[PDB]
Amino acid sequence: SGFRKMAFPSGKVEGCMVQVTCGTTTLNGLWLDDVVYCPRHVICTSEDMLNPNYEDLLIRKSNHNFLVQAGNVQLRVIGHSMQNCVLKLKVDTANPKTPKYKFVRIQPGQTFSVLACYNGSPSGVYQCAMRPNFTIKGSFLNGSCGSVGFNIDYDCVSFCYMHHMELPTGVHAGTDLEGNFYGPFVDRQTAQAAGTDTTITVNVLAWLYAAVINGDRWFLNRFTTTLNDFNLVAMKYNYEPLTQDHVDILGPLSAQTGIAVLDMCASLKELLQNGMNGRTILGSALLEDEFTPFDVVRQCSGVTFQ
């Protein structure tokens, strides 16, 4: 028992991280087979950053402008192309550590592990959620661009995030691995703000189930509620609407604990209306929303990865 903010084991991704230097910019790249993926703003200079035209910028580049360092090994760029906001550097060597992988674009509310890197070297791993406003609340300093987010499914690494930038509230924005930003953000250093965020309701409910699975039951009640009546309460507290498909996803957890989804909804409704009143759930005094239903089932039943 117990319940922790748990990241996937990061070994399969660590074997893909490289350093990419161009001009005065150094950031991280992802080395899969003979291609290195990195943010296209690696080709911007300290004054191109305001309104860059990346097609012009890139056509002025030669392959030898790109310094790719894989550990103590300098990799030779033999070609480059831009796909949306990511640069793809064709290199002459296939990464022998390339895992089985996929590129996926995730939905808001889904979670992933971030492998924070600097100069091609991993610094730390942590769990994130794609917030409803398409930012992530990460931990990223200068040089971290090109760090990736990912999920592991048995043996397959699904990459879903590459880091590009930090917004003024301290939260983070980036793209999928095909270079499409999450959210309305653009890589260009003009004024942008995150947009109002909301709480991921289905995830809060999954975490309340995690709590029950782990012996916290003090927040439960006899009441039930209708989805309609729950969603009126959610709105007022800035929670995502709970859909019927959310309710279905929560089915396994509901069945394992014997608490009907709409009953947990009545519990959450009282937690929103009364607060927690000096009590904690799973070591938190806040309602936690960065565990998906799958996250809860995985950690509470012990799924592993080869």
Q: Which residues are catalytic?
A: 41, 145
The pair phi, psi for residue 8, each rounded to 5°, is -70, 150
Does position 58 interact with ligand NOL (CB under 6 A)? The reply is: no
Residue type, 28: N
* 8 Å CB contact between 47 and 165: no
User: Which of the choices a copy of itself, ligand NOL, none does residue 189 contact, using the CB cut-off of 5 to 8 A by kind?
Assistant: ligand NOL
Pick from 140, 161, 182, 239: which binds ligand NOL (CB under 6 A)? 140
CA distance 79 to 89: 6
The pair phi, psi for residue 242, each rounded to 5°, is -90, 120
CA distance 44 to 224: 56
Pick from 4, 191, 228, 306: which binds ligand NOL (CB under 6 A)? 191
Nearer to ligand NOL, 87 or 205 (CB): 87
Pick from 59, 72, 73, 141: which binds ligand NOL (CB under 6 A)? 141
The pair phi, psi for residue 211, each rounded to 5°, is -60, -50
Does position 98 interact with a copy of itself (CB under 8 A)? The reply is: no
Of the candidates 220, 240, 102, 78, the residue with the CA atom closest to the CA atom of residue 159: 102
Number of residues that bind a copy of itself (CB under 8 A): 55
* 8 Å CB contact between 225 and 262: yes
CA distance 192 to 174: 13
* 8 Å CB contact between 134 and 172: no
Nearer to a copy of itself, 188 or 298 (CB): 298
User: Which of the choices a copy of itself, ligand NOL, none does residue 301 contact, using the CB cut-off of 5 to 8 A by kind?
Assistant: a copy of itself
Tokens of 217: 């039951």
Nearer to ligand NOL, 59 or 141 (CB): 141
Does position 280 interact with a copy of itself (CB under 8 A)? The reply is: yes
Segment interacting with ligand NOL (CB under 6 A) among 60-68, 154-162, 165-173, 297-305: 165-173
Number of residues that bind ligand NOL (CB under 6 A): 22
Binding residues among 63-92 for a copy of itself as defined by CB under 8 A: 71
Residue 107: count other Cβ atoms within 10 Å of its Cβ.
10
Q: How far is CA 303 from CA 22, 58, 155, 258, in A?
A: 41, 44, 12, 22
Does position 3 interact with a copy of itself (CB under 8 A)? The reply is: yes
The pair phi, psi for residue 241, each rounded to 5°, is -60, 140
User: Which of the choices ligand NOL, a copy of itself, none does residue 145 contact, using the CB cut-off of 5 to 8 A by kind?
Assistant: ligand NOL
Binding residues among 217-276 for a copy of itself as defined by CB under 8 A: none
One character per residue 119-158, x = contact with a copy of itself (rule: CB under 8 A): x-xxxxxx-x--------xxxxxxxx--------------
Given the rule CB under 6 A, which residues bind ligand NOL? 27, 41, 44, 49, 140-145, 164-168, 172, 187-192
